[PDB]
Amino acid sequence: TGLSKEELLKVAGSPGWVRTRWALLLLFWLGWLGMLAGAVVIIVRAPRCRELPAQKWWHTGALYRIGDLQAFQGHGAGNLAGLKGRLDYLSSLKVKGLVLGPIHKNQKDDVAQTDLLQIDPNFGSKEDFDSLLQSAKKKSIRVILDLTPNYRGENSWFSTQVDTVATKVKDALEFWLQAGVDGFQVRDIENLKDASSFLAEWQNITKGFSEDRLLIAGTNSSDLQQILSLLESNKDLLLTSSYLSDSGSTGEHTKSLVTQYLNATGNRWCSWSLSQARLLTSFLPAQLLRLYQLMLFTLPGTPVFSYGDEIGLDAAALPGQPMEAPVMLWDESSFPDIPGAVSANMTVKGQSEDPGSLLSLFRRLSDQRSKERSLLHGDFHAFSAGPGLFSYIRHWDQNERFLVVLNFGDVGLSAGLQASDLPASASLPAKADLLLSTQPGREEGSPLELERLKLEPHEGLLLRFPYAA
Amino acid sequence: DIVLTQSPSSLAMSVGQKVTMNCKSSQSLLNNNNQKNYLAWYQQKPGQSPKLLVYFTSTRESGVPDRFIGSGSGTDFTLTISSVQAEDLALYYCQQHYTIPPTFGGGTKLEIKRADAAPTVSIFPPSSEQLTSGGASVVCFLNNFYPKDINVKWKIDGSERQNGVLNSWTDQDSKDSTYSMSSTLTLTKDEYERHNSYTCEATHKTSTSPIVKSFNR
Amino acid sequence: GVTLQRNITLLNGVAIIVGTIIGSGIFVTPTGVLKEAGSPGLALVVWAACGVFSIVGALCYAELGTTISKSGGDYAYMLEVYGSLPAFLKLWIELLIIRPSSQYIVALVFATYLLKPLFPTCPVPEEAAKLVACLCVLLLTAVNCYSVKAATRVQDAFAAAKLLALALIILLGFVQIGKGFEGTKLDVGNIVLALYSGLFAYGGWNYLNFVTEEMINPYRNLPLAIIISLPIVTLVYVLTNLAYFTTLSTEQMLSSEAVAVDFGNYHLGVMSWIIPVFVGLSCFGSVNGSLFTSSRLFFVGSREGHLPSILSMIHPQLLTPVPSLVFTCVMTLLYAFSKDIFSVINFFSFFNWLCVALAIIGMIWLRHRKPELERPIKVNLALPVFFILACLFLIAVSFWKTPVECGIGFTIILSGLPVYFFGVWWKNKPKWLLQGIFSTTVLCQKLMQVVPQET
Amino acid sequence: EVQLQQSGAELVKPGASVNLSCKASGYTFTNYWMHWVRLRPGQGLEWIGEIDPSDSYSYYSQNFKGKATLTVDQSSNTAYLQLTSLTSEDSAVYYCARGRQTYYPWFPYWGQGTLVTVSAAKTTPPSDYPLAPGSAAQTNSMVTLGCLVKGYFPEPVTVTWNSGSLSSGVHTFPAVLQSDLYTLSSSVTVPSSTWPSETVTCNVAHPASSTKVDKKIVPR
Numbered sequence A: 001t002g003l004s005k006e007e008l009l010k011v012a013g014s015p016g017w018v019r020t021r022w023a024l025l026l027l028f029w030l031g032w033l034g035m036l037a038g039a040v041v042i043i044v045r046a047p048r049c050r051e052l053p054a055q056k057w058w059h060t061g062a063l064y065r066i067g068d069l070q071a072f073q074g075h076g077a078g079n080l081a082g083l084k085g086r087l088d089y090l091s092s093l094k095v096k097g098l099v100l101g102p103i104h105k106n107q108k109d110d111v112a113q114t115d116l117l118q119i120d121p122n123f124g125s126k127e128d129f130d131s132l133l134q135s136a137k138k139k140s141i142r143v144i145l146d147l148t149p150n151y152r153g154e155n156s157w158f159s160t161q162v163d164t165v166a167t168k169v170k171d172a173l174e175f176w177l178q179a180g181v182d183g184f185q186v187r188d189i190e191n192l193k194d195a196s197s198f199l200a201e202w203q204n205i206t207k208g209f210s211e212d213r214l215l216i217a218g219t220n221s222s223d224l225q226q227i228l229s230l231l232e233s234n235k236d237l238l239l240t241s242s243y244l245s246d247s248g249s250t251g252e253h254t255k256s257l258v259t260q261y262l263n264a265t266g267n268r269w270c271s272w273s274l275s276q277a278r279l280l281t282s283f284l285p286a287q288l289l290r291l292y293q294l295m296l297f298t299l300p301g302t303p304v305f306s307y308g309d310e311i312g313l314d315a316a317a318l319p320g321q322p323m324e325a326p327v328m329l330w331d332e333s334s335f336p337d338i339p340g341a342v343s344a345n346m347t348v349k350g351q352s353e354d355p356g357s358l359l360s361l362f363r364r365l366s367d368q369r370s371k372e373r374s375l376l377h378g379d380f381h382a383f384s385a386g387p388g389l390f391s392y393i394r395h396w397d398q399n400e401r402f403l404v405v406l407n408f409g410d411v412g413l414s415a416g417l418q419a420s421d422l423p424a425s426a427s428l429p430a431k432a433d434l435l436l437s438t439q440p441g442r443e444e445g446s447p448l449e450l451e452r453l454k455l456e457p458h459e460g461l462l463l464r465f466p467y468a469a
Numbered sequence B: 001d002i003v004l005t006q007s008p009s010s011l012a013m014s015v016g017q018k019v020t021m022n023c024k025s026s027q028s029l030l031n032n033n034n035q036k037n038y039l040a041w042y043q044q045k046p047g048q049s050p051k052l053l054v055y056f057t058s059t060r061e062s063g064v065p066d067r068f069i070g071s072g073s074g075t076d077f078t079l080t081i082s083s084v085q086a087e088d089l090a091l092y093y094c095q096q097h098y099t100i101p102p103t104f105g106g107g108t109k110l111e112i113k114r115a116d117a118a119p120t121v122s123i124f125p126p127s128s129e130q131l132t133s134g135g136a137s138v139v140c141f142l143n144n145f146y147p148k149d150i151n152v153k154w155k156i157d158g159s160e161r162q163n164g165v166l167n168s169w170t171d172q173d174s175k176d177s178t179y180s181m182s183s184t185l186t187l188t189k190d191e192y193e194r195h196n197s198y199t200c201e202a203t204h205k206t207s208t209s210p211i212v213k214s215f216n217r
Numbered sequence C: 001g002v003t004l005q006r007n008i009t010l011l012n013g014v015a016i017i018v019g020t021i022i023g024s025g026i027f028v029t030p031t032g033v034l035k036e037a038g039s040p041g042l043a044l045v046v047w048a049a050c051g052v053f054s055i056v057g058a059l060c061y062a063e064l065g066t067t068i069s070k071s072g073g074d075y076a077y078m079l080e081v082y083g084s085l086p087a088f089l090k091l092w093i094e095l096l097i098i099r100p101s102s103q104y105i106v107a108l109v110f111a112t113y114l115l116k117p118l119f120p121t122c123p124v125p126e127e128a129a130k131l132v133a134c135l136c137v138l139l140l141t142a143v144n145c146y147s148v149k150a151a152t153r154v155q156d157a158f159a160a161a162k163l164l165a166l167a168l169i170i171l172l173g174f175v176q177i178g179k180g181f182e183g184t185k186l187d188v189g190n191i192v193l194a195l196y197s198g199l200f201a202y203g204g205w206n207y208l209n210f211v212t213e214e215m216i217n218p219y220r221n222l223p224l225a226i227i228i229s230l231p232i233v234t235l236v237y238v239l240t241n242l243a244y245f246t247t248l249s250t251e252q253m254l255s256s257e258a259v260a261v262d263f264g265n266y267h268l269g270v271m272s273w274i275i276p277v278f279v280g281l282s283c284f285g286s287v288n289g290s291l292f293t294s295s296r297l298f299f300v301g302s303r304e305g306h307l308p309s310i311l312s313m314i315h316p317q318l319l320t321p322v323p324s325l326v327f328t329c330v331m332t333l334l335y336a337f338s339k340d341i342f343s344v345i346n347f348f349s350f351f352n353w354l355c356v357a358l359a360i361i362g363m364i365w366l367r368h369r370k371p372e373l374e375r376p377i378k379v380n381l382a383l384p385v386f387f388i389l390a391c392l393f394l395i396a397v398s399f400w401k402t403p404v405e406c407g408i409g410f411t412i413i414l415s416g417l418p419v420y421f422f423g424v425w426w427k428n429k430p431k432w433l434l435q436g437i438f439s440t441t442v443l444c445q446k447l448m449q450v451v452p453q454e455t
Numbered sequence D: 001e002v003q004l005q006q007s008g009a010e011l012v013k014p015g016a017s018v019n020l021s022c023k024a025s026g027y028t029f030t031n032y033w034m035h036w037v038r039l040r041p042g043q044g045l046e047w048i049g050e051i052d053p054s055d056s057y058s059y060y061s062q063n064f065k066g067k068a069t070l071t072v073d074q075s076s077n078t079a080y081l082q083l084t085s086l087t088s089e090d091s092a093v094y095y096c097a098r099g100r101q102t103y104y105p106w107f108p109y110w111g112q113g114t115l116v117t118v119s120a121a122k123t124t125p126p127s128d129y130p131l132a133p134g135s136a137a138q139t140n141s142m143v144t145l146g147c148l149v150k151g152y153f154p155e156p157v158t159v160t161w162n163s164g165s166l167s168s169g170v171h172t173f174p175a176v177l178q179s180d181l182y183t184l185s186s187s188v189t190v191p192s193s194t195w196p197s198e199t200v201t202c203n204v205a206h207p208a209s210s211t212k213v214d215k216k217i218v219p220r
């Protein structure tokens, strides 16, 4: 053992040791208080967080347009109560939205027999519509309704007496908001006289109801200036267009179409889409479908797909069907009019199983863009990473940073990234984690050496890397 | 990087005949998405830049004679010349263009075969200006012969000389497919002074006896 | 003259157990059960289920600690059955790894969450977080040197802060119902990992046993402080889970890294910062309860000769085991150097349940060997055997979750054998060790005025 | 026409940098990227890198990264390759090349190569010495004439006869390197009527020391 009670007390008593005990008490408290002052110093002399910008629901991920309820389903089941069945698919796509292509009672080119308020009974009843809409709310899919008046006709706003047509809409928006829809799509605004003024009125009506409702305009236009003019007076309008459509058909122009438009609008909110209505595959050749899905899900803004983009549907592949409204391929039954023409891999069922499939890439990306604060509303910095590459970093104040590297040209790179002139806040790491590639045969999850990386023709990469103070 | 083996390294062939280069790539250069093969052939004549012959394995460049046919897929590729002309002697390189940076083959030297011919032999006494330098150079030219293999004896007052002798062959002449060769002997002025009779004699497979030229200073 | 006096009244005994059970767990761990249950219904059932399992285990310790009144708790109950070496191999792992890592981890959770409302959207600065962890550990080993009445008044205060925070959470849940089962991962291989990931949030129920010897009336109050607490915890847990499900959708709880803070953001708006601060103050309570309890484990280990004699010494005018406390603080702060920390604890997933299973197996063997030993509690033998059988399954599950890491842990357990043979079997024979041991001992006694306890 | 052209010859003392320079003509210079390729003797072509004249971005093979440096001058259609840390084994011919498509690497248009020699031995202008047959010269119908080029440096010396007029029947033998100075000789054959009756000159020319010399072949 050691010293006894009495023995320890008698020796401890010595004034030297009593002063030492007093000294060390005081020393300990001084050291802890020093550390307390030190930690308070660190807390104050340290970088603050950036306030999260207030985000409407349509910032938080992809919308999804259904131009004809019949073509999405097959006939007979082509009604709103049919669509109420499908939302578990949509919830799997993580689509924070829907757009029901027009369901109002339109008679072709007849201004007087057309109404924007009564629904066309082929699709069901308002009692069906509400049943859907309540289910969609329950499943976190907001629903927009498309109000373009003459949708069975040639010219969607009719040829004549446009102010009566605008009056129909002015009334319609109020009714359908009271019914509980989250917003409205209108189309073909190049066919509408005095377009900017009517959009300004309808936008005022919508935001004047509530701040969490939107109006999605759409135009057939691909002119940067025309589009910037429709977006001048209206400032929280999504305006879908053909602007990315004229891509050069081996991607070659896209780095430039995208970074001009961001620059020109001043990095406001945007909606990326290759059209106001038609499929991606109406424009892209099919080697780029994967590459565009990587890009549309990772630019600043709300991407928009038409139905079946998520599976690379194509109107031409099963001949005779209209390029307006191709029949969606759920499973091998889905186009029975020429049986045996449907291959397994062309269908939702046939892709849902396969990690390599297009729909397995869409599902995966939709996740990232809807959870990760950096893709949800980070900044965007393009840089010259390589010959073909469109490359850019999405980032937010300290969260995860995402570098995207799209190889649009048809020649692989064999020599790494080699970034000229990164912003000093956003410098590239020596290595970053592959979160996915557009191509099979990659070590997903693993860190890559950016100076010694090798992209194939058309290989896009999504690299994830952590912050630096 | 990709690596391209090329063979044969030499391909000696006769005028009018068909010839074949093989190029062999360490990866496939078929682009699945587009169903064409990324390869090109360049001809480099002696003393000139590379000229592009064909690209995407078969597409002739404009201003290319139609005797160059390129073919193959995957990794076995061949440039063929249907009927070799005297103007075609060159190194030929294959290059991939499936990745940037590209890479090239080590190249096939095409050589021409012709009817054998004996050298025109000529010998030149030292230049009267050179004699100012304290040195002198004696030069023997062997012109327009085939094949390349040759040897030269230098004799000086009958003594055989093997120090300070140098040789240079031309590349094979594209008009006539003959070689030519220069032989040089360099002397001090006093070494050129002390001896009287200089001989260059050349042995070439077209003659049993050597060909001879000589001069007396 | 000098001993650890019986300061702990029943309500402070309930504080030492509820304060160390409620932990960080319920405010951030719900996500772990939804991940393996899929369904709010199956989740809310396994929360109740590992509750009643924990009650059944605690009722075995409510027996053991009345049969054996030593403050070694989980360690003493091994020593009184399996003898010298098996008890040491426990104490070594507790000393070297489990208690100082646990103390540090929960202090760092105190630091981060207490700071969090200065840094809402981003990391709290790491060089600040480690100081504010160390200031906490240092302060509570100061307080637990000054007086056991101060120590237990601190844990009354923070045990109250914890239950107040859960009451506030539950109340806002019912208010949201006043304002107006799903897809289930029904595989047994999913359910077992749901249950095993939930049991962590009850871990702590054994901690009262390491302070049996300082209870005012152990034979009454030690089983009562268990039954007054674990049913209360179980109720509060199933109600708190219920409250989260009124406000956070399944997708949101599967993907939020601080569950209580999201519930705070939804209900309190400008005042949301209250819930982060309560998770912080909640963890402070757990550091104090752990430091207190932990100091007694090493004290007892030295009294029974397993551990160097300085740790048995007490300060005569304050009656707190100052060298054991000081050792426990220092051993905690030595974990502040490590760039990663949770891994070192994850290596011993199996160890807690293994020791518990060995204690209750011990209670079976102790009933066969010495029926004449006094037993104020005598539980129906069904419950021990049920609980043992269940733990032997969970120990296997703990390996099956990660067969590498439980092997690393088992490798480190064998580090106890070198130290046992050098420290116990060798009798410290070399005079250049033995005289140095003594010289260091008498220095420490002099340096902080401490003396051996009196039988 | 499309035509790239380059300086002929560069001498570099080991370890020093050099600028090799390439002026384009006959096309819109910003539309097409410019590539630099090299040809080590007896060892096959190797590609350095390329540059975009529209924004001065440049991409380089792993072997050259940081060792090379491309820039460009849009005001003159000129591309410049800096090379640095040059060793003896970086002696080569450096070729400037243009792509067909905008940056894709296959090379229809090449500049005539810049011959880069890396050596400490000094620039040395050539000494030219004419050769005439002497004894029994006119006894044959065709007569050969010659021009020794001796002790010069660096490698590229050019010979043409009568200002390129006698481009038929000329043999110029590759240079021989001796004691870090080159030796070369050139030869021509003409009718026995021509040589004593007419001007004959080797028009020797040397890019790297600017000397141009027209020695007349006069009988002994």
Ligand SMILES: Nc1cc(COc2c(Cl)cc(C[C@H](N)C(=O)O)cc2Cl)c2oc(-c3ccccc3)nc2c1
Binding pocket: C020, C021, C022, C023, C024, C025, C026, C098, C102, C105, C106, C200, C201, C202, C203, C204, C207, C345, C348, C351, C352, C353
């Ligand atoms: N063998 C063993 C034993 C204990 C002690 O017993 C526990 C205690 Cl004292 C507290 C908790 C968590 C607590 N119930 C809470 O709600 O945070 C779990 C266990 Cl197993 C461990 O604690 C921890 C632990 C404590 C806090 C954070 C992270 C890990 N690991 C342990 C390993």
Ligand SMILES: *[C@@H]1O[C@H](CO)[C@@H](O)[C@H](O)[C@H]1NC(C)=O
Binding pocket: A204, A207
């Ligand atoms: C449109 O709304 C804005 C507020 O968002 C308001 O300033 C403006 O006066 C409104 N105009 C009309 C005609 O409603």
Ligand SMILES: *[C@@H]1O[C@H](CO)[C@@H](O)[C@H](O)[C@H]1NC(C)=O
Binding pocket: A190, A191, A220, A221
């Ligand atoms: C867009 O609409 C205008 C006006 O009717 C028309 O002139 C133009 O050709 C249309 N373009 C497309 C691509 O539809």
Ligand SMILES: *[C@@H]1O[C@H](CO)[C@@H](O)[C@H](O)[C@H]1NC(C)=O
Binding pocket: A263, A264
């Ligand atoms: C577009 O980008 C350039 C980048 O240099 C910038 O100078 C310019 O101000 C931006 N905006 C417009 C309208 O050109």
Ligand SMILES: *[C@@H]1O[C@H](CO)[C@@H](O)[C@H](O)[C@H]1NC(C)=O
Binding pocket: A343, A345, A346
């Ligand atoms: C799907 O499978 C078919 C049949 O094997 C094949 O021809 C085709 O290339 C595949 N891809 C698509 C999208 O059709």
